[PDB]
Amino acid sequence: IERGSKVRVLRPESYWFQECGSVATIAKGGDRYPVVVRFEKVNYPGVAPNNFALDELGEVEAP
Amino acid sequence: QQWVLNPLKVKPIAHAIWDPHFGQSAIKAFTRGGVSYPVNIATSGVYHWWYTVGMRTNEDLYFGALGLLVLST
Amino acid sequence: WVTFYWHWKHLTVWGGNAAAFNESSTYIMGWLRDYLWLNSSPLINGYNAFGMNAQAVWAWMFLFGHLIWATGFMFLISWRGYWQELIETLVWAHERTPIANLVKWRDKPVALSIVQARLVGLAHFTVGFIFTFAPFVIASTTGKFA
Amino acid sequence: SHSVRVYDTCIGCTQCVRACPCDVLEMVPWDGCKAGQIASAPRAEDCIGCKRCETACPTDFLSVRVYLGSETTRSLGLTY
Amino acid sequence: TSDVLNLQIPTPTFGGSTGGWLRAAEIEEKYAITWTSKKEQIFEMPTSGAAIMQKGENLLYLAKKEQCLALSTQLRTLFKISDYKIYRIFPNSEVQYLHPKDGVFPEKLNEGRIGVGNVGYSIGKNPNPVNVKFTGKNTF
Amino acid sequence: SKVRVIVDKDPVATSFEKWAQPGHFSRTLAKGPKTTTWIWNLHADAHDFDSQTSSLEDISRKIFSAHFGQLAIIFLWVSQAYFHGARFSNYSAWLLNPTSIKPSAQVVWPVVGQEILNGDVGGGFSGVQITSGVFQMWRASGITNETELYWTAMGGLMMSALMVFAGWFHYHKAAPKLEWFQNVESMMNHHLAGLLGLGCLSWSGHQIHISLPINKLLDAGVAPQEIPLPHELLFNQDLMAQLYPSFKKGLLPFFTLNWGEYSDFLTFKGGLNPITGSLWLSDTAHHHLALAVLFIFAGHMYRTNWGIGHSMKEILEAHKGPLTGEGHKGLYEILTTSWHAQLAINLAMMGSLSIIVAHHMYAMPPYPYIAVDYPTQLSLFTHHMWIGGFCVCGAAAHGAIFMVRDYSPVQSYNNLLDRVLRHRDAIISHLNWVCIFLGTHSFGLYIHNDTMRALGRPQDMFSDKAIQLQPIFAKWVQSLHTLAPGNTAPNSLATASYAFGGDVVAVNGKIAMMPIQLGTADFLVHHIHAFTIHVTVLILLKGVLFARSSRLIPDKANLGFRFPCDGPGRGGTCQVSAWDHIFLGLFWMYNCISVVIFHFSWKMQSDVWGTISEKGKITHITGGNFANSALTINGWLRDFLWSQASQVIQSYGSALSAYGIIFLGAHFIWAFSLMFLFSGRGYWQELIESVVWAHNKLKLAPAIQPRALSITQGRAVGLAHYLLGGIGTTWSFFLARIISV
Amino acid sequence: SEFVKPYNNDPFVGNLSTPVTTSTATKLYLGNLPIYRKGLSPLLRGLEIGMAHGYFLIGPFYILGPLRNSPNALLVGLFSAFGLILILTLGLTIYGLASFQGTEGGENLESAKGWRNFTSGFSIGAFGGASVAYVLLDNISFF
Numbered sequence A: 001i002e003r004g005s006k007v008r009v010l011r012p013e014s015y016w017f018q019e020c021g022s023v024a025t026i027a028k029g030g031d032r033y034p035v036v037v038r039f040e041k042v043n044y045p046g047v048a049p050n051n052f053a054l055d056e057l058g059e060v061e062a063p
Numbered sequence B: 001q002q003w004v005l006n007p008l009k010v011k012p013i014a015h016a017i018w019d020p021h022f023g024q025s026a027i028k029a030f031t032r033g034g035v036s037y038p039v040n041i042a043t044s045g046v047y048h049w050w051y052t053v054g055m056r057t058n059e060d061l062y063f064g065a066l067g068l069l070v071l072s073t
Numbered sequence C: 001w002v003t004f005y006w007h008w009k010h011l012t013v014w015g016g017n018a019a020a021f022n023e024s025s026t027y028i029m030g031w032l033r034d035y036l037w038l039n040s041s042p043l044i045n046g047y048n049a050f051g052m053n054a055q056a057v058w059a060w061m062f063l064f065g066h067l068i069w070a071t072g073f074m075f076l077i078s079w080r081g082y083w084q085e086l087i088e089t090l091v092w093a094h095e096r097t098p099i100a101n102l103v104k105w106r107d108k109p110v111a112l113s114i115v116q117a118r119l120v121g122l123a124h125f126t127v128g129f130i131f132t133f134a135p136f137v138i139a140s141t142t143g144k145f146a
Numbered sequence D: 001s002h003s004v005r006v007y008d009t010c011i012g013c014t015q016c017v018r019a020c021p022c023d024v025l026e027m028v029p030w031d032g033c034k035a036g037q038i039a040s041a042p043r044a045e046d047c048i049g050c051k052r053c054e055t056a057c058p059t060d061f062l063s064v065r066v067y068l069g070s071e072t073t074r075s076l077g078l079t080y
Numbered sequence E: 001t002s003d004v005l006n007l008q009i010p011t012p013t014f015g016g017s018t019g020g021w022l023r024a025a026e027i028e029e030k031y032a033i034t035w036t037s038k039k040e041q042i043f044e045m046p047t048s049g050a051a052i053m054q055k056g057e058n059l060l061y062l063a064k065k066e067q068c069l070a071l072s073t074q075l076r077t078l079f080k081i082s083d084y085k086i087y088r089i090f091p092n093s094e095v096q097y098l099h100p101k102d103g104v105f106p107e108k109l110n111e112g113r114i115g116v117g118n119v120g121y122s123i124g125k126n127p128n129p130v131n132v133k134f135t136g137k138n139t140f
Numbered sequence F: 001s002k003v004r005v006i007v008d009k010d011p012v013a014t015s016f017e018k019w020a021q022p023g024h025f026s027r028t029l030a031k032g033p034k035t036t037t038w039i040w041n042l043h044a045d046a047h048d049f050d051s052q053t054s055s056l057e058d059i060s061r062k063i064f065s066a067h068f069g070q071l072a073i074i075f076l077w078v079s080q081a082y083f084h085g086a087r088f089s090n091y092s093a094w095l096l097n098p099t100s101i102k103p104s105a106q107v108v109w110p111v112v113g114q115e116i117l118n119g120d121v122g123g124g125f126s127g128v129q130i131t132s133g134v135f136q137m138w139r140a141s142g143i144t145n146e147t148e149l150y151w152t153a154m155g156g157l158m159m160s161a162l163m164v165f166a167g168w169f170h171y172h173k174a175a176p177k178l179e180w181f182q183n184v185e186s187m188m189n190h191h192l193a194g195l196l197g198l199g200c201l202s203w204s205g206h207q208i209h210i211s212l213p214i215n216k217l218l219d220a221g222v223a224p225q226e227i228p229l230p231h232e233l234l235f236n237q238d239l240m241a242q243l244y245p246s247f248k249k250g251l252l253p254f255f256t257l258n259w260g261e262y263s264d265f266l267t268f269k270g271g272l273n274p275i276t277g278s279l280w281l282s283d284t285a286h287h288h289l290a291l292a293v294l295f296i297f298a299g300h301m302y303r304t305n306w307g308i309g310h311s312m313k314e315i316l317e318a319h320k321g322p323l324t325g326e327g328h329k330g331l332y333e334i335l336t337t338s339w340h341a342q343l344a345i346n347l348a349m350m351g352s353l354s355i356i357v358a359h360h361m362y363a364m365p366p367y368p369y370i371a372v373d374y375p376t377q378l379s380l381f382t383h384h385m386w387i388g389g390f391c392v393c394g395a396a397a398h399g400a401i402f403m404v405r406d407y408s409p410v411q412s413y414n415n416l417l418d419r420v421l422r423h424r425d426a427i428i429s430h431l432n433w434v435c436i437f438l439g440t441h442s443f444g445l446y447i448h449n450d451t452m453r454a455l456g457r458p459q460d461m462f463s464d465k466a467i468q469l470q471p472i473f474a475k476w477v478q479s480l481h482t483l484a485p486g487n488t489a490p491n492s493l494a495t496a497s498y499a500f501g502g503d504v505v506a507v508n509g510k511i512a513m514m515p516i517q518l519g520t521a522d523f524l525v526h527h528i529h530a531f532t533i534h535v536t537v538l539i540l541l542k543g544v545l546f547a548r549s550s551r552l553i554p555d556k557a558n559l560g561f562r563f564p565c566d567g568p569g570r571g572g573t574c575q576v577s578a579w580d581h582i583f584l585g586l587f588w589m590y591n592c593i594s595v596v597i598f599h600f601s602w603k604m605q606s607d608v609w610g611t612i613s614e615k616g617k618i619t620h621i622t623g624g625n626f627a628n629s630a631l632t633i634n635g636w637l638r639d640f641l642w643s644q645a646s647q648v649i650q651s652y653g654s655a656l657s658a659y660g661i662i663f664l665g666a667h668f669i670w671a672f673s674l675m676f677l678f679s680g681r682g683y684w685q686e687l688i689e690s691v692v693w694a695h696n697k698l699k700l701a702p703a704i705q706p707r708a709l710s711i712t713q714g715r716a717v718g719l720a721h722y723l724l725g726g727i728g729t730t731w732s733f734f735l736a737r738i739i740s741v
Numbered sequence G: 001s002e003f004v005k006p007y008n009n010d011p012f013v014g015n016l017s018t019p020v021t022t023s024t025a026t027k028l029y030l031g032n033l034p035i036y037r038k039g040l041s042p043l044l045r046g047l048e049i050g051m052a053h054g055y056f057l058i059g060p061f062y063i064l065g066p067l068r069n070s071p072n073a074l075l076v077g078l079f080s081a082f083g084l085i086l087i088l089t090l091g092l093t094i095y096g097l098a099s100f101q102g103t104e105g106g107e108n109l110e111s112a113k114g115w116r117n118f119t120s121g122f123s124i125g126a127f128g129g130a131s132v133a134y135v136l137l138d139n140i141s142f143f
């Protein structure tokens, strides 16, 4: 996946499970959840983005 | 005994009332049925059920009570 | 709802007046004025200013179930915080008054917990429900004999 | 006393520590995020359970979790 | 610092309130907070009312840790005092140091702290409560 | 000249631009909605000007312009009553016979079978009966013609347009500065003299010159169409001298201080007018003159531009004692820098004043033929009771808002507010003990009477034929009032009101006012009233005092005035905010006012209202059963509710069927309230998630995400539905009962 | 002047030194009652409390009881006072059992021996006070 990709979230406890989001930044380091995905729908706290791991995103559309 | 002889007109009795809080008119008001003491009229239908299954006297009910007491023991 | 339907239908059938149910059961005011208001007259007149009869116990239990159903609304509508602050003020009152502060509790008084409060209010609601429907369904049938 | 756990979805944005009214939480060094820190709960006996830390977490389904458990004179907030 | 408290520090001038510590502070547990002021001014007590804080060093006894930390929050977000110390006084005259433990505030990172309660997986990977049945332990 | 007019010119441009940008007033809501909570937050924060701007000047300007808009609405509401009386009423036929024609000023359109509501109100008219008492109010002013009602409606419309223009003008053209609003001495002087005293003086002038001659001619038997017009009476000393033989002397005895010559139309006879069953209008005009002189005199107290007068800062700061420290110091700055404190005082005064109006207008009927109009009396009493209760709850609400927001410890050190806050546990504890004592006694006497009557022991009850509880103090006060004319009111012909004892007043068979006897049931229900008032005071005062902090939560002021909780911690911190205390106290206000109006309705139907026949045979509406049936809860349930609901449940098929419909609907709404009052947000959020799954499946997900109502909003919705259902049920029950008997 | 000051010179204790809490009149009243009087064994404290309480408790049963309009009104009131005194004595004993356990005893009231002596004194005093007020009420025409 790359920055600007459209991904589908596979984390079951996430608010955006099986929902589409846009990759914002992939950090290159020791981070356990490096990929930053921004969503168009806020969750119950009202937070739009979240940090996700590389195996929790299923990918939909290339940049 | 009285209810078996006339089931449609005699009110079935649950048990007798003991209350030191009653006035006089409450004692005369709750004195109903064939008995002369304050009393509660049974609304659970146990009289008809026992009457069908062969109960006819108070001794039969007392012996059933003894049998169920021994069973509970 | 089920017991109201059964009781009113059988009250009209036993009295030979099923037309009353058949005409008044189609609208809510018919229920209100022909079952509940009409059949409460032998119940609420169990004791009055002119004396009492054998349905005075059913009238007393009717009011009893009303009061229990009503005091359920306490625990169902008001929630812990108000009562915890009230308990704390009462704790200060007992601790800071002479003569009576020598009597000391072993368990610190606290307000009822949230789940405990819901349970207590629900149990109150249910007990008041049963104890206000049973005297009506017994005394109204007893007060009419039909 | 309540039990407080912090999971590895922490980003080290420190809002739980600031939101804590009982000095339960603190920041310890870590290497699993960009901020280089993870929250910790070394004083869970002073937890009252008001869950102000869980309101302050920005991560999706909050990383700091408070499980209500045994009740003491501290977790009940009793002044008497 | 350490587990030492100066008992003779002057207290803020307060007219006495009906919000102070009850009988279970000389019996079970008591808390105190000490801070340094630059000027004589008026602050709101966590147990209602207003008190004048003395210029210099102050000492104030409270009943719970929440009151001490709320007063410390007032002494931070308002007029800037950031050197307060919160203690815990036992009925046998034993004092224990609580706030600014390692000497620095908990929000700032400090090398030498050990993570307590950290879990090495996401919250959605906890075991099912069936797997801990009749064991006494929990899935936290 | 310290008191001056300083005004900004054109502060805000008039434009339809922020109309299309909802939520513009606040910082958070102006960014657009993401969920369906921005809508409810938009509605909740519309009038919270203190959270929109930090400038007191702009807040004051918004308040002033909103006051103008409110006054415009009230002027339109006066104009509706005058126009419906002019065009849609039977006011002329009521004037020709104000004892058999029922007032009606509201006609329905026949579309759906609702033309059955146009009942036979008499006078060849069909319409809905009116219990407002506007007909008697117009008759007390001499409005016998139907043209004057029309022109009063037109003038009300003109005044409403004037208030709309003034509201636009003082916010968009000429908005006063902050120094203009803070002239509280000038405002106080101008209100006390120019508003109150000049209104009393002008109304007394209108009364003397119009309503006294017209009502005197009406009571003399002259038909309204042969009565001289008010402009023909205004400038005719000969005709007024024919009616009142003191206008021959003119205005000369007024200036020579020979005011005893004006005793023909300025009396202190008291009592009731036997023709109409109301207060004498000469007494009313004299009363308004005394009030006008008193208010104009009182409006000369406070200092303005000239050296005479008082400063309210110096009066407050001089009142201090040993037990109160600094006294009232700092209250002047509190009440001149905060609007919420002024609401907290003014709402309490206005609610108490409405309750006083309710207690005074029933025992002293001030309008002709309003005493024999029982629905009007019942409706006015219950109306003003409910308005007073709502306002007295709002006073505590705004006291809590002031304590959370505008309180400052540096400003209010060691003054009365500080001393009250420093011992609030003692206040709340002792009021708690008083509430428990009053409740146990007042309610357990009822329960004991229930038990004794149910056990067949009427000789052990708390009744007049048993252990007696006679209200000896109230009877002594009544006996003092009955002996007042001649002894302690020497220049008085009759008593102040006949409720204190005296003679029965009857107007064409019906009883206007007769003595009200107090027994053990009255003692019992007055103690019930005191207990309910005390518990409402306990809840509201605990909310005000513990609005900033408590032992449970030391930093409650940092959480805000309204907030749902502080988590499940400390055993549970549910409903700790002062808002939740107002929410809980509104229920107890409802309980108190319901018991008060039930007491009024039963006692007046049982011991006052009725008919009189030959040789003074009095037959009341219910038969005098309040003395023996209001001692038990069963007596209340059977003889008030069950016995008087017969009119509202049998109203179907008649002109009162709308009351039965509203009875059923208000029961429905009251039961619908418990859905919000008992349940919680999380269940509804999960159910909404389950519905959102189906919507997402059918591509129907709204971009504004649907959410459950918030916890505070859920409580507010449940409380509003509860109050609406209860007030509607009582409203329909009272109106359908008292119209039909 | 200022008649409300911090209680016992401590400004942070939850009490105030009002003219009700710390007046000399209130100290003389509430320092000379049996529960607070100096030099009293717990039995004498209980006895002096009990006689006043028994006198009190036979007060309302005779006048307001169900058999008030009966020739046996005073006897029934005395028996009702005896029953209430027995209930209060049982409550005192169970309070002492629940509160004072593993105590050293002595003349202090907050101990097992002290509370047992206090309860014994209260019981005998309460029965005696009820009997004395019965005797005075039966011959009330003497005064």
Ligand code: CLA
Residues within 6 Å of the ligand: B016, B017, B018, B019, B020, B021, B026, B040, C056, C057, C060, F450, F451, F454, F455
């Ligand atoms: C002051 C009010 C009052 C009081 C105290 C009583 C007292 C009594 N009435 Mg009564 N009554 C009253 C008013 C009152 N009445 C009125 C106004 C009426 C209307 C006229 C009546 C009509 C009436 C009738 C018709 C009857 C009574 C009966 C009784 C007796 C029932 C005792 C019993 O069986 O215990 C048992 C009590 C219970 C089962 C209730 C307790 C329920 C609890 C809450 C359940 C949970 C318990 C829990 C486990 C804790 C228990 C611990 C355990 C170790 C025990 C008792 C003497 C009955 C009787 O004669 O009995 C012999 C009877 O038939 N009364």
Ligand code: CLA
Residues within 6 Å of the ligand: F063, F064, F067, F068, F071, F180, F181, F183, F184, F186, F187, F190, F191, F193, F194, F195
């Ligand atoms: C004698 C002068 C005078 C009078 C009559 C009033 C009257 C009023 N003021 Mg006011 N005021 C005055 C001086 C005066 N003020 C001064 C000097 C100040 C500055 C210190 C203020 C500052 C002030 C504020 C800040 C506010 C008021 C408000 C009000 C209204 C209160 C609501 C009410 O009772 O409705 C009664 C309603 C009526 C009596 C209807 C009549 C309305 C008109 C405008 C009254 C005057 C008519 C005219 C002068 C009389 C002509 C007589 C003619 C027929 C012969 C009321 C209309 C409040 C309000 O509602 O704002 C709109 C408000 O918020 N005033």
Ligand code: CLA
Residues within 6 Å of the ligand: F043, F044, F045, F046, F047, F048, F049, F347, F390, F391, F392, F393, F394, F395, F397, F401, F561, F562, F579, F582, F586, F720
């Ligand atoms: C002089 C009267 C007056 C004034 C000016 C205010 C003014 C204010 N109050 Mg207040 N209040 C009052 C009386 C008053 N109140 C009374 C009498 C009570 C007791 C019930 C309260 C209780 C109260 C609370 C509890 C709160 C306020 C708040 C507020 C502030 C914001 C209000 C807002 O935005 O609502 C916007 C207006 C609405 C949302 C409209 C409400 C519509 C109601 C609920 C329904 C009415 C139904 C109708 C009568 C019948 C319908 C029939 C049906 C068939 C359709 C504002 C300063 C709030 C605040 O935060 O203050 C800072 C707050 O939390 N007030």
Ligand code: CLA
Residues within 6 Å of the ligand: C067, C070, C071, C072, C073, C074, C077, C078, C082, F432, F433, F435, F436, F437, F438, F439, F440, F443, F444, F447, F535, F538, F539, F584, F587, F588
């Ligand atoms: C019918 C229903 C009902 C009843 C009985 C009560 C009863 C009470 N409420 Mg309440 N409440 C209710 C509904 C009810 N509430 C609802 C629906 C709400 C939601 C809005 C609330 C919200 C509410 C608040 C917010 C507050 C109360 C408070 C109180 C107490 C007032 C103090 C008092 O006089 O107690 C005395 C007891 C009574 C009046 C009822 C019993 C009376 C009996 C007949 C006589 C005495 C019996 C005796 C003690 C026991 C003998 C029998 C036993 C041995 C078997 C009291 C316990 C206040 C409180 O606790 O502060 C003091 C308070 O602040 N309530």
Ligand code: CLA
Residues within 6 Å of the ligand: B021, F440, F441, F443, F444, F445, F447, F448, F451, F460, F461, G057, G060, G061, G064, G065, G066, G067
């Ligand atoms: C709080 C309400 C209340 C009150 C005042 C009463 C009062 C009474 N009831 Mg009753 N009752 C009530 C509720 C109440 N009831 C309820 C709710 C029920 C149903 C459960 C009943 C059921 C009932 C029955 C079944 C019977 C009564 C009976 C009685 C009478 C005698 C009882 C008696 O002597 O008790 C004992 C009283 C005392 C021990 C007195 C204690 C109170 C003292 C005076 C307090 C003093 C405090 C002091 C002033 C503090 C200041 C001290 C300072 C100076 C230092 C009496 C008139 C009897 C009767 O026949 O009536 C004629 C009877 O048989 N009651």
Ligand SMILES: CC1=C(/C=C/C(C)=C/C=C/C(C)=C/C=C/C=C(C)/C=C/C=C(C)/C=C/C2=C(C)CCCC2(C)C)C(C)(C)CCC1
Residues within 6 Å of the ligand: F078, F079, F152, F153, F154, F155, F156, F159, F198, F201, F202
């Ligand atoms: C109903 C209504 C209306 C109407 C109203 C009116 C009609 C009013 C009027 C008013 C008026 C019409 C007023 C008047 C006033 C007057 C006055 C207030 C006067 C005063 C005077 C004086 C104060 C005097 C003084 C003096 C003396 C005594 C001595 C010295 C000299 C002199 C002469 C100065 C409207 C439409 C609006 C609306 C609806 C409701």
Ligand SMILES: CC1=C(C/C=C(\C)CCC[C@H](C)CCC[C@H](C)CCCC(C)C)C(=O)c2ccccc2C1=O
Residues within 6 Å of the ligand: C074, C075, C078, C079, C080, C081, C083, C084, C087, C110, C111, C112, C113, C114, C117
């Ligand atoms: C009234 C009320 C209280 C107050 C109720 C309390 C504090 C309990 C009342 C207990 C009654 C008075 C019985 C007390 C027990 C008896 C003394 C018997 C003792 C039994 C033991 C020996 C086992 C709450 O705590 C509460 C909490 C959450 C939501 C709503 C509410 C609520 O409505």
Ligand SMILES: CC1=C(C/C=C(\C)CCC[C@H](C)CCC[C@H](C)CCCC(C)C)C(=O)c2ccccc2C1=O
Residues within 6 Å of the ligand: F675, F676, F677, F679, F680, F681, F684, F707, F708, F709, F710, F711, F713, F714, F715
């Ligand atoms: C039902 C319920 C909800 C769900 C309620 C919601 C989502 C409100 C929905 C508002 C609607 C959309 C407004 C319009 C209502 C109808 C569309 C119109 C009905 C019109 C009638 C007059 C016929 C809560 O969110 C809640 C929160 C806290 C405590 C209790 C409760 C609660 O009881």
Ligand code: SF4
Residues within 6 Å of the ligand: D006, D009, D010, D011, D012, D013, D014, D015, D016, D017, D038, D039, D056, D057, D058, D059, D062, D063, D064
């Ligand atoms: S608020 Fe949550 S995400 Fe942020 S540091 Fe604390 S535990 Fe980690």
Ligand code: SF4
Residues within 6 Å of the ligand: D004, D019, D020, D021, D022, D023, D024, D025, D046, D047, D048, D049, D050, D051, D052, D053, D054, D066, F569
């Ligand atoms: S529950 Fe409250 S006290 Fe405990 S860690 Fe969270 S915020 Fe801090």
